Ligand binder design. Structure first.
Ligand SMILES: CCC[C@H](NCc1c(COP(=O)(O)O)cnc(C)c1O)C(=O)O
Ligand SMILES: CCC[C@H](NCc1c(COP(=O)(O)O)cnc(C)c1O)C(=O)O
Lengths: 297, 297
């Protein structure tokens, strides 16, 4: 067992895909990354919303001032080449990461050129498919006036780490974070939805959350299924009182939340319908959505 | 030209001191680092407050939940061995960095063991010794309720990057950041002092700043010199109206601020006295302080 990894145009062994410990990306949290799934349906391997993830990678890089010298098209091709070169025929999580490979102590990162690495890794479920127990954590989500939280920027994730570790140490599966204004915004690595009186609600972008591609997927799904949907701020009380709640994300997929700070919630019907639909979409069984699947072979 | 670098007990070439691009330290800003100077006085090479920096490295790691399997003593010896092994006889900036060397997508970083790398690099002045022009930037310093800013934690520095880049792009030498409550707290990589009516003032730790070892040095210096000193919050207006102001830091040393957002300040007498004293201290000419100098040879 040793898989290949794309790195600035070249396939190398995992063991050779390394960056100097003096990199300002390692020292100062200055890079961007992505999370992309590929699903095996029995007949092919499909990368889900590949192009969308690669355009977001570049939006992230533009947001933080990182120069990524590749286009979204190149990056997309790179993913396909990398999955091929390994001959995977199973569910993958794909990690592109863009970082500075030059050693540099100076915070002045102007004019640097990012490298990109892409790894593909066998991956099953991230959260219990039957539902997870969640805790609102003491750590607040980092705020837009301090760090650009809408970007999937590496240094921001120290915030997600504090959150994730705190919930897990206390026995739970996942953290929920509030923003600076006390609104429910995000799991450590998931966007969040609740259902209240048959309306689906998810915090708006302006609340300071990652603009998740799963989130966006679920918004279209709700459009198709005729489920009324509001992008509206959510408070802790609404979460405690929700008829249902669930997390969404590339790794997380669609996962029900069956407990929040000891308050029990049903594994609910809207969650279930959305989870079933999303599975059909990613496995290639919904014709309308095939433009979002990139065949590897 | 190729220098040696300490890495988990072993001296290796810079080119071999590399970490997998899948490291949660690279992907999620989860590590800690230090900044340590060594000064050449003509007769020896002295590392300044080595032990203090290494104990802070470990406080940082304890703060963010990173397990560093070395003691401050070991880390100190490592620095000396590394400077020796390179045979430097000149001014150095030393970068220890503690990070996770295992590849890992999961945010669950519990139970991991950090590696440490230590590099030493020739280094002269960071900011113009005659004084710098500074701008209060649009980016706020990250807040304690979101990230542990008192630690020298890698992912936090994306905040310092946004600040430093913004000031430099607009033509200035350095950024000043306000905290969430609007108080002047820190440069992108410096603590800040002002002098108002002959009293030296620097923001208190609780304002959300790095507990700088230079800052601490200057507080003792002021004690010795009989300069009244307050650890008190500073507002923008006080900075505009200061009789003098200056930045301090390992890299920065003691640097006057001669302009803030177009408002001119004198290169002042207290700044000068503190800069002259600090130089004498680090070059070994002040007997009282010799316990803070570690001879390399
Ligand atoms: C492992 C870190 C989590 C990681 N990010 C997913 C993620 C999301 C949802 O984003 P999307 O639906 O675009 O996947 C929301 N919020 C955060 C903090 C995330 O990490 C993931 O790649 O799934
Ligand atoms: C290159 C990043 C700046 C870096 N940190 C120094 C530094 C200080 C002052 O700390 P000390 O006096 O302990 O050095 C204050 N504040 C910040 C944000 C810093 O980066 C330095 O190593 O000097």
């Amino acid at each position: 067992g040793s898989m290949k990894v794309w790195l600035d145009g070249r396939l190398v062994d995992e063991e050779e895909a390394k960056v100097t410990v003096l990199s300002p990306s390692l020292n100062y949290g200055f890079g961007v990354f992505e999370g992309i799934r590929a699903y095996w349906n029995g007949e092919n391997l499909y990368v889900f919303r590949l192009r969308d993830h690669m355009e977001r990678l570049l939006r992230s890089a533009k947001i933080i001032g990182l120069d990524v010298p590749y286009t979204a098209e190149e990056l997309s091709k790179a993913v396909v080449e990398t999955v091929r070169a390994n001959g995977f025929k199973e569910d993958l999580y794909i990690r592109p990461v863009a970082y500075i490979s030059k050693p540099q102590i100076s915070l002045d990162v102007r004019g640097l050129q990012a490298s990109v690495a892409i790894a593909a890794i066998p991956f099953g479920k991230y959260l219990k498919v039957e539902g997870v127990r969640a805790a609102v954590v003491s750590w607040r989500r980092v705020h837009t006036s301090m760090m650009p939280v809408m970007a999937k920027a590496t240094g921001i994730y120290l915030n997600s780490i504090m959150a994730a570790v705190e919930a897990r140490a206390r026995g739970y599966d996942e953290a929920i974070m509030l923003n600076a204004e006390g609104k429910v915004v995000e799991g450590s690595g998931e966007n969040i939805f609740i259902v209240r009186r048959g309306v689906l609600m998810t915090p708006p972008l302006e609340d300071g959350i990652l603009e998740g591609i799963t989130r966006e997927t679920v918004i279209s799904i709700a459009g198709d299924l005729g489920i009324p949907l509001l992008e509206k701020s959510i408070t802790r009380e609404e979460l405690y009182a929700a008829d249902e709640a669930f997390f969404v994300g590339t790794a997380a997929e669609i996962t029900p939340i069956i407990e929040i700070d000891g308050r029990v919630l049903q594994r609910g019907p809207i969650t279930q319908k959305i989870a079933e639909t999303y599975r059909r979409i990613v496995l290639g069984k919904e014709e309308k959505y095939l433009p979002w699947l990139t065949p590897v072979y």
